């Protein structure tokens, strides 16, 4: 398995376990999270969350707090072991049985040591469902 | 019913490549355009850092597209929250003699600048994903 694939799949594991330390351990010091790409609540300046301290806070706020799960629909390797794209479905679960989802394209780049430098989400609110 | 700059640019670029329209395709590109089709080292990305700038992009069109009987099928589009970046799932289908063909299905991302011009086009596929018939 490629370094990009190992990292994407580890990241979902850690997001599902609320494993803050394990999740941050996957990230390069210069990691940029754009989930989604563009101005949103989870990308409030439209240019990404930069660096592990800020990415730790993002984790506390939008991940540690919620009941987030990841379903992987399809994986698209590139010709680089270090870059990969997936179709994923993000599941957030509320009290009383309520769930929101968003199905998007997520791209991951790692550096040469195998750490996440970029996580980029092609989705917006018109793609979110609630049930 | 107005489409984003990223969506206009990517539909126009499919149109131009299939029309074998090199100059209309190049007119869609920024001066600092980089095409990584695919991302990573490959026949169409020899050093794995993309085809950079409009002169090399025109040459890429002259070697790899002028040449072949290309159909792009857009299977699915994924807008982002930026009007300037978009992803699609595309099937790229090439026709060869004796009804022999190749196909690759992958993810393609596009980014445009403020002026609506393509700065980046990146494809997630490799030779082992390609199918022939």
Shape of chain A: globular
Instruction: State Rg of chain A.
Output: 14 Å
- Determine and state the CATH class of chain A: Alpha Beta
Structural domain count of chain A: 1
Reported CATH architecture of chain A: Roll
Q: Biggest interface, which chains?
A: A-B, 28 and 28 residues
Q: Oligomer, anyone? A: homodimer
**Would you list the SSEs of chain A in sequence order as H and E?**
HHEEHEEEEE
β-sheet strand percentage of chain A: 35-45%
DSSP E strands of chain A, number: 7
The major pleated sheet of chain A works out as: 7 strands, mixed
Helix content of chain A: 10-25%
- End-to-end span of chain A in angstroms? 35 Å
Question: Do you know the CATH topology of chain A?
Answer: Nuclear Transport Factor 2, Chain: A
Which features characterize this protein?
homodimer, isomerase, alpha+beta, 131 residues, Nuclear Transport Factor 2, Chain: A
General description of the model:
2 copies of one chain form a homodimer. With 131 residues, chain A is α+β, with helices and mostly antiparallel strands. Chain A has a single domain (1-131), classed as Nuclear Transport Factor 2, Chain: A. In chain A, 24% of the residues lie in helices and 40% in strands. Chain A contains 3 helices and 7 strands. Chain A has helices at 3-16, 20-24, 52-64; strands at residues 27-34, 49-50, 69-77, 83-93, 99-110, 116-122, 128-130. In chain A, strands 1, 2, 3, 4, 5, 6 and 7 form a 7-stranded mixed beta sheet that branches. The longest helix of chain A has 14 residues, at 3-16. At the A-B interface, strand 4 and strand 5 of A face strand 4, strand 5 and strand 6 of B. Chain B: This is Steroid isomerase, putative. Chain B: InterPro entries: NTF2-like_dom_sf, NTF2_dom. Chain B: Residues 9-132 form the Nuclear transport factor domain.
């Amino acid at each position: 398995q490629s370094p990009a694939l190992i990292a994407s799949q580890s990241s979902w594991r850690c997001v599902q376990a609320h494993d803050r330390e394990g999740w941050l351990a996957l990230m390069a010091d210069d990691v940029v999270i754009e989930d989604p790409i563009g101005k949103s609540v989870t990308n409030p300046d439209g240019s990404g969350i930069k660096g592990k301290e800020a990415v730790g806070a993002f984790f506390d706020t939008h991940i540690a707090a919620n009941r987030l799960t990841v379903t992987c629909e399809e994986t698209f390797p590139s010709s680089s072991p270090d870059e990969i794209a997936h179709i994923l479905v993000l599941h957030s679960e509320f009290d009383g049985g309520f769930t929101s989802e968003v199905r998007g394209v997520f791209t991951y780049r790692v550096n040469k040591a195998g750490l996440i430098t970029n996580m980029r989400g092609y989705w917006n609110l018109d793609m979110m469902t609630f049930g």
